[PDB]
Amino acid sequence: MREIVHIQGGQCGNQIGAKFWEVVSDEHGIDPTGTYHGDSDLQLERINVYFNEATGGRYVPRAILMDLEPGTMDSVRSGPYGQIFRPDNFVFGQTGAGNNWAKGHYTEGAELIDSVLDVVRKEAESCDCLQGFQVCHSLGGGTGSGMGTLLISKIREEYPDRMMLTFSVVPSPKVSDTVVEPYNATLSVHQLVENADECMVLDNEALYDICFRTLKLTTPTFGDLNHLISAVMSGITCCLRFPGQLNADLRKLAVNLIPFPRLHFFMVGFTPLTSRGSQQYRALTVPELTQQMWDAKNMMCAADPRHGRYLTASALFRGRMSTKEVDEQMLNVQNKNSSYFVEWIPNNVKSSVCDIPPKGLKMSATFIGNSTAIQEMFKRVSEQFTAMFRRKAFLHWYTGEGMDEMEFTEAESNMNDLVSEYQQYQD
Amino acid sequence: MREIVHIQGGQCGNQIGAKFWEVVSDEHGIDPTGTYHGDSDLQLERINVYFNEATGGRYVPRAILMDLEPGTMDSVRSGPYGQIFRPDNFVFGQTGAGNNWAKGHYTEGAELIDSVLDVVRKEAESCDCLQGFQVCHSLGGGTGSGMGTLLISKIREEYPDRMMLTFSVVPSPKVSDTVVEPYNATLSVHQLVENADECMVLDNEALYDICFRTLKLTTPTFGDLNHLISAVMSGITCCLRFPGQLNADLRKLAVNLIPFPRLHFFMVGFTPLTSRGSQQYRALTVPELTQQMWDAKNMMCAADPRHGRYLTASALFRGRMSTKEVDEQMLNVQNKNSSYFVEWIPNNVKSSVCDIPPKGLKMSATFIGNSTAIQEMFKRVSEQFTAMFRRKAFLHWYTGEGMDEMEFTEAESNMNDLVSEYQQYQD
Amino acid sequence: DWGPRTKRSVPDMPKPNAFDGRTDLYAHMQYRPLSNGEQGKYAKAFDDRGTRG
Amino acid sequence: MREVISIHIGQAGIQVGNACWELYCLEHGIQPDGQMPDAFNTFFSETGAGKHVPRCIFLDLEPTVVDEVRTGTYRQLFHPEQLISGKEDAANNFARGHYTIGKEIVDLALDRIRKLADNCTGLQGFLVFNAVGGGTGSGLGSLLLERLSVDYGKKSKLGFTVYPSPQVSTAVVEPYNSVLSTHSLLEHTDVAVMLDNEAIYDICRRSLDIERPTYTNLNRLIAQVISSLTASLRFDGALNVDITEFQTNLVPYPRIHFMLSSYAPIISAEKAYHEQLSVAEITNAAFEPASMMVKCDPRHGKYMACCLMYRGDVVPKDVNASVATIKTKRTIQFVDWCPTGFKCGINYQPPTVVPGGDLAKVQRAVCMISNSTAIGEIFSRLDHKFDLMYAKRAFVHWYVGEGMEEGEFSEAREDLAALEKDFEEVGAES
Amino acid sequence: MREVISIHIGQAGIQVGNACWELYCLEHGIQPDGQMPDAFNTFFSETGAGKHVPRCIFLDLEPTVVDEVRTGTYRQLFHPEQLISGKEDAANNFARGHYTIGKEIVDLALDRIRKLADNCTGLQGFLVFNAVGGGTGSGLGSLLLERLSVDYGKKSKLGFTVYPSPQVSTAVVEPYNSVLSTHSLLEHTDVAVMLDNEAIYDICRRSLDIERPTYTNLNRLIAQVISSLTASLRFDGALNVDITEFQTNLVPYPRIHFMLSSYAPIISAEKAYHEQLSVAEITNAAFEPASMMVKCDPRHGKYMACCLMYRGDVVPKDVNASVATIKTKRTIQFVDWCPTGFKCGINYQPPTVVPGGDLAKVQRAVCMISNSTAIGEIFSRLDHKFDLMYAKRAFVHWYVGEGMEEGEFSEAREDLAALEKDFEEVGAES
Numbered sequence A, B: 001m002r003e004i005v006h007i008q009g010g011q012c013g014n015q016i017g018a019k020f021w022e023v024v025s026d027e028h029g030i031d032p033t034g035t036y037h038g039d040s041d042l043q044l045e046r047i048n049v050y051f052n053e054a055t056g057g058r059y060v061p062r063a064i065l066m067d068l069e070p071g072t073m074d075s076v077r078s079g080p081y082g083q084i085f086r087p088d089n090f091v092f093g094q095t096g097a098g099n100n101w102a103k104g105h106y107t108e109g110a111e112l113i114d115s116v117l118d119v120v121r122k123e124a125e126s127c128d129c130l131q132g133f134q135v136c137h138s139l140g141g142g143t144g145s146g147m148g149t150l151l152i153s154k155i156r157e158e159y160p161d162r163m164m165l166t167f168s169v170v171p172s173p174k175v176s177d178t179v180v181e182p183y184n185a186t187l188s189v190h191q192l193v194e195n196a197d198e199c200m201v202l203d204n205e206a207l208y209d210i211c212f213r214t215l216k217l218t219t220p221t222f223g224d225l226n227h228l229i230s231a232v233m234s235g236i237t238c239c240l241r242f243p244g245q246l247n248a249d250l251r252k253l254a255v256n257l258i259p260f261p262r263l264h265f266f267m268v269g270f271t272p273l274t275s276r277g278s279q280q281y282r283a284l285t286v287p288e289l290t291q292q293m294w295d296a297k298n299m300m301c302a303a304d305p306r307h308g309r310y311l312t313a314s315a316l317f318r319g320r321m322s323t324k325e326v327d328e329q330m331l332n333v334q335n336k337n338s339s340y341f342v343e344w345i346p347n348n349v350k351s352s353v354c355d356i357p358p359k360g361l362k363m364s365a366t367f368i369g370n371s372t373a374i375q376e377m378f379k380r381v382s383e384q385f386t387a388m389f390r391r392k393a394f395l396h397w398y399t400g401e402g403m404d405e406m407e408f409t410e411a412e413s414n415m416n417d418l419v420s421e422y423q424q425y426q427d
Numbered sequence C: 001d002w003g004p005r006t007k008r009s010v011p012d013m014p015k016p017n018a019f020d021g022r023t024d025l026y027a028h029m030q031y032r033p034l035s036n037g038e039q040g041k042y043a044k045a046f047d048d049r050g051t052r053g
Numbered sequence D, E: 001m002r003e004v005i006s007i008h009i010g011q012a013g014i015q016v017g018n019a020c021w022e023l024y025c026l027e028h029g030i031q032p033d034g035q036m037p038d039a040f041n042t043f044f045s046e047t048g049a050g051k052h053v054p055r056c057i058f059l060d061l062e063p064t065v066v067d068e069v070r071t072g073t074y075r076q077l078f079h080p081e082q083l084i085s086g087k088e089d090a091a092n093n094f095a096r097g098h099y100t101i102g103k104e105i106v107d108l109a110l111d112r113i114r115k116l117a118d119n120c121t122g123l124q125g126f127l128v129f130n131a132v133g134g135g136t137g138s139g140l141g142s143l144l145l146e147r148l149s150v151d152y153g154k155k156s157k158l159g160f161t162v163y164p165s166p167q168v169s170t171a172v173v174e175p176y177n178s179v180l181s182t183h184s185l186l187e188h189t190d191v192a193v194m195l196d197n198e199a200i201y202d203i204c205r206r207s208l209d210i211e212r213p214t215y216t217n218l219n220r221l222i223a224q225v226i227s228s229l230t231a232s233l234r235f236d237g238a239l240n241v242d243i244t245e246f247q248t249n250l251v252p253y254p255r256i257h258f259m260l261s262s263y264a265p266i267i268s269a270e271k272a273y274h275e276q277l278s279v280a281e282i283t284n285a286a287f288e289p290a291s292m293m294v295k296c297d298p299r300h301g302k303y304m305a306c307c308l309m310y311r312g313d314v315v316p317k318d319v320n321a322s323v324a325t326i327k328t329k330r331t332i333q334f335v336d337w338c339p340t341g342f343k344c345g346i347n348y349q350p351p352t353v354v355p356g357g358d359l360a361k362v363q364r365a366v367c368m369i370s371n372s373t374a375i376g377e378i379f380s381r382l383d384h385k386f387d388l389m390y391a392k393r394a395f396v397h398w399y400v401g402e403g404m405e406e407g408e409f410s411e412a413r414e415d416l417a418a419l420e421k422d423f424e425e426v427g428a429e430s
């Protein structure tokens, strides 16, 4: 009877949750009209983690979709499985943050924060036991990063004993989508360390690559990319919604994966990724779900895990599986390559099994990895930020909404501080 | 529970090895679809030696199919029994070696040797305990010669204790399908001495001679020639995949037939060969098989057995038979002509019996001999190598890819060294 | 209670892919068996680009 | 509801605007009378039952370019008070459009902009169309832009202006009229998109294989660039680009705000069948200087910030691979301090084709608006043209006698001289 | 995928390419308009909705021959930009095509090459078609060939050119343009294959028994060689021979890359029934000097490498028996240091017969392309014709005035003289 409240911001956040709540819905067997027509009794046992029961069998999520433009919700208005949401929980803006981190945070940010936090507070008091708050947003943008990161700092003030899952996408190293991309990213990670308790790192270039070499797709849309992200988000809370032989909730991963409070940036992975051409030939047994779990190609982050040591890792298995085959495969990966794991921590791997697989798959598993290789991602964004700030280019906008260069120097100071302690632990 | 990893290299290796997977799947009762339809219980008892279990009862070969051109992969998959292979195991490039040993071994093999080691590892630690690796290629081209022998050198360093059986076709004395055979053949064999542990030498125009005067097939295509080669390949591991009265796996043929570590080149033969109109006149008796097995015209390499003495030989008889007829006609073939056998090795032959005969034949045997007359096929390559190298013709393609002329002379010395160790055993 | 939907409604975007019509990743994420009328396409080709050979 | 107001000033403004609003009524299905047989709110104002009014005004002192709109095929479309005429033109004089006859009509110009701004619910920016060659587009545009920053602060103002070509120009006091305009469009207009008539003459020559281009053909694909610029508001796509998103991505410094323009697919009705139009082909076509819409060579300067707005069947992956192939080319060289030069926008609406037009129906199109240091070649050449003519006081008594003084030539010259210093200083590698 | 760009330079390259692509469109079933009613990707680009365009450019300075293609039956097959023209021809001047008038078009030629190279995912070679008799085929041919080497390094450039015949010559300054082309075609084309008009005249006279052939009859069987060499890329066979396999098996040295050509079953329609076409018979036919497509006798020289390419019902057995009888013949001489001489390739596609062509429908075909020392007689005869004309400076004022200098005629003379010594050196027994 523990609960998770879902909050989302920006273009990137809303499009993920359009697919994320879609993927959750047919796992639980509820129609886009909201009625339940599932064939399994185990689906209705833990619904309250993600849905409010309503009159007539309607189920409405704990979804609070935040944006500063009506464009994102318009896609949610008309997209598939977009009618399940609460109309009152669509807080909206009119001006738009305009891809500016200063506009979403300080000046135009304050006019909507008092309204979006009212929607959060109404849902927080309605459910009894709050496991934590889950946010999905971007970092290089300004609407979901600028307004989102202030919202995370505020909600840690009101609820300091509750965990914080953030699924924030990251500026790609190879390619770029916006021009103020390193500016809005370094200001957000500077705030994400202080407020958030655990972070899942995503980026489109790894989601693009994982759709090519592992899925054999040469035309991946964003809706194809959002599905693989949505499979990861269902895998974290698969223990809450379904039973298992060994149970690991959200707070159990927090004590496992976080040795020190600032080292909460993880990398994700989803195991049964089979192309349709090679779908029949592969078998589904625990040793071959593990061999795709630890592959560097299966990681949905920029960082190559072969570069840096694994400080702590977690695995969220789903399915009817032997407990030895879960145990022995994750024990073999501690002996075959022990140079990639940290010596001064014994048994870096957290494992948990849930007996209810996803729809159709006989077995599945989700990987969360606290690697020190994530410093390669943070170094590159800090490299771009120092290049543009020393010329003070694109800075006359951010100083226009009420910023001075003091926190810009502070953002690089904390960025250089957090990457310094990763490389100190790698030695 | 002893398994073999199959590797196919180049146009010759893919075409030969595709023919290899019908002759072993038919005797294991695997349909072209991929399911099982055999009427015998003994077929499924040992199927892990070549096949990997898949979902739905499917069986897939443990064959990494490797080349540098996409044309042959499309041709192999489009043929009958070509849909059983995994698309992930079809590893290939786009440029093509183009009958150039330097392009295969050094330039264009380097961007693909990382991809082929990734999948031959994935077929190695997936299975229980490796008996060895089997590769089939050509020594005349550049795709299976250069980039094929590069794989053997890499896989011998990674797995040093495993067995290595190579089926390589060698250039003809009489005719010449390409122009740069002896450059490709001398460089490939020099890499093949230290790396590989066995080498079943084949020649295409010994096969044409077999198909003309004995089989009486007036229009032999490559479907004919690969079919004779594939029968020998099924004969070596015949006692692995099926029970036998006297047991002999692939390593039993190693210690019996390799006197000295560089003395490991063999030549092959298949005994129950008669033309289609003359099948009624042949009585399938054990002495009938032995007179064809030891005949010069039946042997599948260009070397003539009467020119040199037999260091060691082996006969792998298949079918229901009496084991003393496996004994005296191997004794009598030494007593009748002892001048053609080595005096200082007594009982130069090894015999084995597998009680499951191949399909359509009730009595068969595959001959593995180690004659010192195999120096003839090496020295006719060597006399062609010295002719072209002294004028440095057709060399700028090889030295345009980083290969200095020093290693050409190094490979020449080993070829003259390997005909030196053979020459002193016939005296 | 909702107003009129803004920003139009584009028809057939993103397009159904050639070499079998794929508008979703449900087949891969649900592990559905391949149909017999569509198995030949993946028998002939490796990637989702159609009929190269 | 989002909305953008377009003001059309000078002879170039209306003739673009006739081509601009022709492209707009075919996208929404609105007939020329104004009747559609939910996304028109960006440009059209719904009134009554089945009537749509363009949210634009035609402001020109010469009545003989506006009256043909008032009697053409678009009589029932425009509001008659939006069409603002005058007694006599400014006669390519900056002093007449700014001091003598400009002030007598700009009061009526603000009277309808306030009416258009009051009818707007949510405003994101302004569009201005003018030519700095003629004093109506140059002087009255300077007067209206200076007044609008006082009247409507901190709002976006998109500058679609046309500059004299190096080898081609159709007026004599164009070096005089362009330099005085640069004192206003520097400090007031926030985004300025240069256009150049001879570069579009060359674009229509080779890509559209038209041997004899006219002013109608040039303005038709001028309408294509602006419609592609604001197609993100009207239709839905993978990556939307809003007006204020467009302004903070390409303006690194408040004075370095002039940007280029490039529309990649210009294909004929007979070459459309033979070209294999993919997102890799059009993206490489946009960065070609042949497709550049201003007569400047980008190889001399450094690209500094670029946006690529895609229309049609553009899937998000290979467009992200198309940008990577542009970055690897040594010819397209970016400035050192900007490792992230690209902005991307994808809309799902293929570009409409006007019936009887010259462009062919394409399923993919990209419009690039890029900030570069090669635009200093545009200003420095017009600086040399002004400095040679001013040195012997040519055509000064026309300008001075209509209210001006000699001191405004020195201030405008010094202001433009700072731009050439600013472009060299910013683009210098450190 | 496998792809190849075929460039055609000069007037003689056009009617060759006019005769190639009419056979290519027939062999893949492409209709003349350009619509097929997977193997076409080597030469045709899939464009939009069921349309194919040839991966080719038809560049020539004289606008007459290219405009014949524009108004011909293949007006819909070709992209209109690929048919590149010019204002005036080089007019039998290597000076004009390489220095004065060739520069204005070679930039436009390389631009479309970059467009075609970008479209193809794997480029295996460039097929260059020219004749060294004319200015455009030699001057513009050398300028494009030099530029294509730098821009696309380490890529095969397959040179298919026509040298002047010993007896029949249609121009006077053909000795001058042949020697100047030889300095450039030596160091730029990786592999060159000669053709001579005299031998093709004799082939049509003896084999096809047509008394008065024209260039249309010449280029049709030229194209039958063209398809036979690229036969491996488009259709599967037992022994594939790619373009990159074609080079590394035939040239023993970089400076010796001039090779002959032959075609075996050149039989008319009435004589095809009586002849028994076996692999043994046509292989003996291909090695005869009558079947040689270049007017030299191979008996004077020595074969250093041969590459036989087979099409149709050919088993791999009898091709080895046929080669064995060829090797045991004593009039056919191989060089002593190359025992392994033959590169054998067997495609399974029988040759296609064009309607109206003199060639008959045959099940088997052999195209033999072989390097030999008998090609040293070609360069000596063109040298002797050049040495006589240059002795007292005939036809030099045309070349000197149009850019060239006097001294570099001796440089091409010494370069051709070194080619004479190199053929004598490589054939000397050791």
Ligand SMILES: Nc1nc2c(ncn2[C@@H]2O[C@H](COP(=O)(O)OP(=O)(O)OP(=O)(O)O)[C@@H](O)[C@H]2O)c(=O)[nH]1
Pocket: D009, D010, D011, D012, D015, D016, D061, D062, D089, D090, D091, D092, D093, D130, D131, D132, D133, D134, D135, D136, D137, D138, D162, D169, D170, D171, D197, D215, D216, D218, D219
């Ligand atoms: N592209 C384009 N440019 C135009 C068009 N009409 C005029 N121009 C440009 O405008 C310049 C002339 O200055 P204008 O601003 O049009 O003169 P005006 O607007 O009549 O100003 P006044 O004469 O004072 O009324 C010429 O050099 C043209 O380049 C047009 O229809 N299309």
Ligand SMILES: Nc1nc2c(ncn2[C@@H]2O[C@H](COP(=O)(O)OP(=O)(O)OP(=O)(O)O)[C@@H](O)[C@H]2O)c(=O)[nH]1
Pocket: E009, E010, E011, E012, E013, E015, E016, E060, E061, E062, E089, E090, E091, E092, E093, E131, E133, E134, E135, E136, E137, E138, E162, E164, E169, E170, E171, E174, E197, E215, E216, E218, E219
């Ligand atoms: N095989 C063949 N050769 C041709 C043909 N037409 C011309 N030639 C050869 O071309 C040589 C002369 O060059 P041309 O192609 O006619 O003219 P060009 O090379 O384009 O040079 P310009 O006329 O100045 O443009 C002659 O010696 C002919 O041998 C043809 O149709 N077939």
Ligand SMILES: Nc1nc2c(ncn2[C@@H]2O[C@H](COP(=O)(O)OP(=O)(O)O)[C@@H](O)[C@H]2O)c(=O)[nH]1
Pocket: A009, A010, A011, A012, A015, A016, A099, A138, A139, A140, A141, A142, A143, A144, A145, A169, A170, A171, A172, A177, A178, A204, A222, A223, A225, A226, D238, D239
């Ligand atoms: N996975 C995914 N990422 C997206 C999508 N749309 C935008 N993004 C990412 O969001 C980043 C830009 O941030 P932006 O959307 O402007 O953030 P916003 O200003 O808060 O809306 C880019 O790096 C994109 O990769 C989407 O539909 N799916």
Ligand SMILES: Nc1nc2c(ncn2[C@@H]2O[C@H](COP(=O)(O)OP(=O)(O)O)[C@@H](O)[C@H]2O)c(=O)[nH]1
Pocket: B009, B010, B011, B012, B013, B015, B016, B097, B098, B099, B138, B140, B141, B142, B143, B144, B145, B169, B177, B178, B204, B222, B223, B225, B226, B229, E238, E239
């Ligand atoms: N037994 C057999 N030999 C073949 C076949 N195809 C080609 N060969 C031999 O391979 C040699 C040419 O090598 P090649 O095919 O180019 O090898 P690659 O470079 O690895 O592709 C010739 O001498 C043929 O004798 C086949 O189907 N069966």
Ligand SMILES: [Mg+2]
Pocket: A247, A248
């Ligand atoms: Mg517990």
Ligand SMILES: [Mg+2]
Pocket: D011, D062, D089, D090, D134, D136
């Ligand atoms: Mg006027």
Ligand SMILES: [Mg+2]
Pocket: E010, E011, E012, E062, E089, E134, E136
């Ligand atoms: Mg000509």
